[PDB]
């Protein structure tokens, strides 16, 4: 933002602003798949309980 | 706030969401070294003398407040274009060489 | 944290981010399902009695 202008300074920062909001979703995704099998193995714990 | 994230008038018991708590800062501190000069801008720009284009001569310019805005003001200019920097943001960056 | 991590410390970019539409809001309620569940997967084993 102190080196560019308004006019294409938002060029870059799209690119910047889509690239951590993609690189923060695949950790929402491998966190719902890590979230499965826990909860498939509650219910056999809570079976052999 | 928690009636008005809800997109309700009701809201049910227990414990909710909200926005964040971001301390606000107080005031504000700039500082630069000390070099109080002018730079030999005024030197290389209005040279009598410029070299042939394959026998170019580079200067070295060190120790020096640099103002861009005696520079930038001349109106015969045909071109003036920066790829890494913007042309009007040079006058609060302080530069290694 | 939607802002911190991707605009931290900036006030320009916290602008920007609210016209990438309700994205981020989708990664708070994301986050809390799995939370939730962390405090059923301990309460439905070990406190059968």
Redo the contacts between chains.
């Keep these: 933002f102190s080196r560019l202008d308004k006019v294409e300074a938002e060029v870059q920062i799209d690119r910047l602003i889509t690239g951590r909001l993609q690189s923060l979703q695949t950790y929402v995704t491998q966190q719902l798949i890590r979230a499965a099998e826990i909860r498939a193995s509650a219910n056999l714990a809570a079976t052999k309980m | 706030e928690t009636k008005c994230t809800l997109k309700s008038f009701t809201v049910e018991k227990g414990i909710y969401?909200t926005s964040?708590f971001r301390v606000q800062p107080t005031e504000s501190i700039v500082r630069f070294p000390n070099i109080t000069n002018l730079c030999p801008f005024d030197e290389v720009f209005n040279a009598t003398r410029f070299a042939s284009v394959y026998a170019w001569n580079r200067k070295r310019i060190s120790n020096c407040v640099a103002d861009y805005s005696v520079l930038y003001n001349l109106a015969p200019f045909f071109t003036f274009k920066c790829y890494?920097?913007?042309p009007?943001?040079l006058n609060?960056?302080c530069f290694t060489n | 944290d939607c802002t911190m991590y991707i605009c931290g410390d900036s006030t320009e970019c916290s602008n920007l981010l609210l016209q990438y539409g309700s994205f981020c809001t989708q990664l708070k309620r994301a986050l809390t399902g799995i939370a939730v569940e962390q405090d059923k997967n301990t309460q439905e084993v070990f406190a059968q009695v």
């Design positions: 969401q964040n890494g920097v913007s009007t943001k609060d960056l």
